[PDB]
Amino acid sequence: REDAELLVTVRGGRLRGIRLKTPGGPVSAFLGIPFAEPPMGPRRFLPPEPKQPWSGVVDATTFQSVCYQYVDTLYPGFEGTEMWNPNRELSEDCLYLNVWTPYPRPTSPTPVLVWIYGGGFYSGASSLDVYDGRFLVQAERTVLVSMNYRVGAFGFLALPGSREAPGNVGLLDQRLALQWVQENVAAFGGDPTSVTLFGESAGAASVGMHLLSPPSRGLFHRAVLQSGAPNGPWATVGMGEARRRATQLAHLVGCPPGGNDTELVACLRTRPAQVLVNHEWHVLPQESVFRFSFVPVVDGDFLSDTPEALINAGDFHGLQVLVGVVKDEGSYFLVYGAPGFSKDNESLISRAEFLAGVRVGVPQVSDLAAEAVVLHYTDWLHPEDPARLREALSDVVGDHNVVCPVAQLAGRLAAQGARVYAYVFEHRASTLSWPLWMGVPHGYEIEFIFGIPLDPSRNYTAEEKIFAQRLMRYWANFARTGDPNEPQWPPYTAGAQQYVSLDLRPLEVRRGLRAQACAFWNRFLPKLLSA
Amino acid sequence: EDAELLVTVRGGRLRGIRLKTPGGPVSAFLGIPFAEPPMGPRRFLPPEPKQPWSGVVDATTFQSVCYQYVDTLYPGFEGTEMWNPNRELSEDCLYLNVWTPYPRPTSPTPVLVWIYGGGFYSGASSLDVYDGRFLVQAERTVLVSMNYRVGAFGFLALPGSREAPGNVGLLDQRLALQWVQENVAAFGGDPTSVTLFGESAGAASVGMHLLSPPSRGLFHRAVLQSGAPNGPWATVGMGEARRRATQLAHLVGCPNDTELVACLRTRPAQVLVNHEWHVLPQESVFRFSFVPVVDGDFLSDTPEALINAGDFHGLQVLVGVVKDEGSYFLVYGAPGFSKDNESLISRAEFLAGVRVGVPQVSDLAAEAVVLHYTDWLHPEDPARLREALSDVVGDHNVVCPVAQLAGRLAAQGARVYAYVFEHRASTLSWPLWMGVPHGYEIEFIFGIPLDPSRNYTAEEKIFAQRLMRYWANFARTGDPNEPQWPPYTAGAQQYVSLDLRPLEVRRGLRAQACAFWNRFLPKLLSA
């Protein structure tokens, strides 16, 4: 009649899950659990309302809809881009979460990993195949949770000060999911006193913002930030710029026929979701890569100050964090607008294309700041060698957007009481479809963290499956103990700046997360932008 | 009497002296007056040609050194005393010296003209390290050296005034160059093959003659050693020159530019010298009070502006630096440094040294320097900070001005040869942490190691003979070769290392560091 392992009661009511086959054994999965009221119609742009209790049994047996988002069409049918595209229908009815737990249910409380996907705050879904939590749960006997959150205008369009579109509601969907975990994860065997957030890119920036927001900080105990930080130049926006982009989006879709914020949002709520998605990229002030229209707003509520300020002034005793980057963070973003770049050739750019790419990769800085960038990333013994120029532009975008914000986040946390571990992911997957010059691109450590190479229908090498199991062990040991060890992985500190390389070879300790370059981005360039 | 030692120039008759070298004799004519003594009412005025004389001027010994500060940092120490005046000081100092082979050449012989350095505040043609006897015997050239007014006597300027016009020390040099054109053939020299060479402020002087049309017709080739006219220390603007001259007057009790200069001319020369260093606007190393002024006359624009707009086709220049240009200047004001300790400074002292080594720049510019010269994996290492500050000072003041001058000239038609002098003399008295300090290639260029009464090794004498051949090859043909030394170009940026080993070709005169000083920092300062 019924399998008791697949029946769980939470606060809202009863749920029914599925038994998942994994290479290593069965796993219980509860996919598509509603945690908020559907943010439809009058509740578009509003903070999430908690899901009201239900009678009967909710079938949590498949992934729910993807939150409405732009769908990438740059390389149609290409695996390297389609793997990030929605694998479910688009809907504003999208605030559901997923729980994976061992089969049978754990008898004693079990550490919990909570995943927050990335995608520039304009895309992403917990349902993508590369976020499949079944392998982590089977291999390491943790409970894994992932949630959807609203993206694009639906999650982050802000008319600051207004009550109809206050902004950051996509972050509040994440927080509501975290509150759901605290109240309900024990029913699945999870330990609410041992919750570790991990996320990638905008997911990592989200994790950092929960660290810096007191109402979120009490909902978890450790953090993992992969290829992202809340202090990234793309991750937040000012109140004035948020209002200008919101107002321009309205104007582009016929609203109003600025003004009263209530009349404005009300007009926006009458437009079909796809109409807003279609005009989203037009509100960006300039021709850029690695910039996104609707992102978290620094408005005094969710973030009482900028992530930079909160980081430098924070007390982080009692916190363990694991951070890292891939070896070639910038290359992926260059084929999305940088002159002379394509995945289908070598992208051997000229000096003129390099200088033009600097303004696209570092938008909105004075000519002087752009000149400092070029001075720094030019080899003045080979100022016009195309291969060096291509690699230098990739470093510019990667350093400025990922590596140096990550490094600043690691150094300040370590100096102010936190226990920090840092990595650089240096393995290029045998299955990677991107060209060779891109190296190890952004986002391609995730599949190894989630143990995807263990999927039988894949054709990863046996070496890569060992590698994946090593990384899952590191991540789960961190979740359990705040220490990935059990060759050792030394903590990161502001002085020694030690990190480990993650590849098929054993751990190798190195110093400096591009210390020379990040001194420019983190120490000097802010002083230049102040005068 | 020996006929070889009697020469008639346009002003009258001279009697020289025969000197010994290990390779044979040489004729020397020392202390030839080329200008009327710039005394009394003539102080601060451009030089006037020496009036003809009757009888025979005695040209057998060096004449007086122009009035200058005497360094007292390490009294009795050979490293500093070798640069101090070795004759009595006098304002009557406008004399020059000629060395020629013995017997005097009967065919026109290429001419080398030496302009000494000393920050435009010191120096003398009579110093032992500038002895021309070895070059003349070994390489069969005529060598000329002149004294020129330094300090306030040479470069005090009230711009626009006819009583203190400025740059008269440079005009002293030009007058000697005109004297060379009119009289050097009487010594066997060829006035159509004149090569200027100088070091530090002498090299800056050479560059300024390259950039001044009235001087350009008086020589044909140029050598600039560890100096350039575009250095941040080599010129001053009119406003700052007037302020420094006015501050000097107040410091000596004076007093209308006419009234100001008249009172200044009442003061003993040593009184002006005693207050010279105190007109500088800030504490600093590698800055000097009275330097050439850019007032539209001798220089119609800044040396950088003239270098960028110049057609230099038909010019050959030889330029270079020593391996550690900055180390010597640090013991004259940088906190934590001394020749008697390892000078292992702290980070705080490094940051303090940056403000004195790069004076008169905004805090933002100083931060840019600190960013570029910090190893952010070893930000506090004492030995690394000592080198970094030595690099800051050497790059800012010598290497990058030299590299900018080389690249611009080469890109605009002239043939450049560049070197880095990398041999530390066995006789060097400075501590080992200073490496190859500023100025210690000169003794090898002049062949001083060939002096038997000195302690140079057999290899160092061969090395000195190599360098004399390169320098003389350049003076004869505009090409030091005869392991080839390739020309310096803005793209390939090739230079050679000069030491006991054979020539080695390398690329880039600290290209990464000099891109910052040369390309970025000017834009920063303009904002």
Ligand SMILES: *[C@@H]1O[C@H](CO[C@@H]2O[C@@H](C)[C@@H](O)[C@@H](O)[C@@H]2O)[C@@H](O[C@@H]2O[C@H](CO)[C@@H](O)[C@H](O)[C@H]2NC(C)=O)[C@H](O)[C@H]1NC(C)=O
């Ligand atoms: C390398 O490719 C880029 C991008 O090209 C597109 O992709 C190529 C693989 C090829 O299919 C092209 O025909 C495509 O247009 C080239 O940059 C483009 O160049 C074209 C023609 O000059 C121009 O119209 C586009 O605007 C350019 N796009 C971008 C993003 O720069 C580049 O010229 C190629 N370089 C080579 C051939 O080495």
Ligand SMILES: *[C@@H]1O[C@H](CO[C@@H]2O[C@@H](C)[C@@H](O)[C@@H](O)[C@@H]2O)[C@@H](O[C@@H]2O[C@H](CO)[C@@H](O)[C@H](O)[C@H]2NC(C)=O)[C@H](O)[C@H]1NC(C)=O
């Ligand atoms: C190295 O020496 C300098 C200068 O000190 C002078 O020279 C020494 C060789 C010795 O003769 C001292 O008596 C001299 O005072 C040191 O810098 C000075 O340090 C003193 C304090 O000891 C301080 O009062 C001065 O202001 C400093 N002056 C400068 C130029 O910085 C330096 O600390 C010594 N470093 C070592 C010991 O390695």
